[PDB]
Chain A
Amino acid sequence: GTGYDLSNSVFSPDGRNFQVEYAVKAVENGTTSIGIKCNDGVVFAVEKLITSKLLVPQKNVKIQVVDRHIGCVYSGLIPDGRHLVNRGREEAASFKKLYKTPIPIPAFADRLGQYVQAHTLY
């Protein structure tokens, strides 16, 4: 039969989760953003589209910081990205409160990974 793509957590006959794959399509319809790791740091850059001259130049900042040492940029549905950063922030704070040291990047990654993956379970 069909219908394996109307509800999130459902596995299709070939083991794919169609709703996640359609999410990816929303990502591919968005602005490009990149990241370049360097000899002692990282650089983030993003293309911001100028829908019209009415946009106040340099004000709709898109790149976001987490704690004081992490930068985050994303492509797709901007609001979803913000949502993701809000959680990252709560997650980074939680880590600092209990362990004193600011959140390691690999640990932060997984925090974001687990939350995102959680949204493919139901």
Chain B
Amino acid sequence: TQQPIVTGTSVISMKYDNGVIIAADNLGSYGSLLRFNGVERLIPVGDNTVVGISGDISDMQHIERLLKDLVTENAYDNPLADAEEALEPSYIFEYLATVMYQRRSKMNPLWNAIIVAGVQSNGDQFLRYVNLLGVTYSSPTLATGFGAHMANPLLRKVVDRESDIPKTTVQVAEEAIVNAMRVLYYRDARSSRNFSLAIIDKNTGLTFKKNLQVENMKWDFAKDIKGYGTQKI
């Protein structure tokens, strides 16, 4: 029985021919005050998973601690911890989805929406969502909060169905993700211009880009808008 205080907005992601990409801005809002500008909401787990989290930040920080523990505890009496018995995206997801649902069933949820993006050991892309209610779903594109409304329509024009995944390159995917992030800075009042993006590819592995900024914005047309109807000057 709680209410979120410091919050993170959208986490968007989509899967492409050889991997998945996920991004989330670096803001931690306190209501309408864009309070903290250096919050990383993308959490890499090992070298094959990135968990993006929106929602309550104190709870995200808790989920972070939990993930670091899973890694420590999986290395225990595990000679193959950095190989065959390393944490897979599907393991990290199922674990989180379990916690989320248990917490909702005790009426004390972790006020978050999470997307686990990654690549399985056999090459399969993994992209799955889980939120404060334990609800889970998978799709070629996944976005939380505001991004579900504005990013999905855009990312879906690139990958509308399963067959479209093998026809999409990292270049195309990253371009779409980057554009969605710009649209969100335009229309989401709780967004930040600074963001992070992560690509998990079956060949090149994990590439994590920090300190990205929305660029190439169109604001010039504003010079010609005056009044709200009849004003001429």
Contact = CB atoms under 8 A, between A and B. Distances in A.
A68 interface: yes
Is chain A's binding surface mostly helix, strand, loop or mixed? Answer: mixed
A69 to B, nearest CB: 10
Interface residues of A, number: 9
Interface residues of B, number: 8
A93 B77 contact: no
A89 B75 CA distance: 12
B157 interface: no
A53 interface: no
Contacts of B79: 59, 61
B65 A68 contact: no
B69 to A, nearest CB: 7
Given A61-B79, A67-B72, A68-B75, 12 more contacts: A59-B79, A61-B77, A64-B76, A64-B77, A65-B75, A65-B76, A68-B72, A89-B73, A89-B76, A93-B69, A93-B72, A97-B65
Interface of A: 59, 61, 64-65, 67-68, 89, 93, 97
Interface of B: 65, 69, 72-73, 75-77, 79
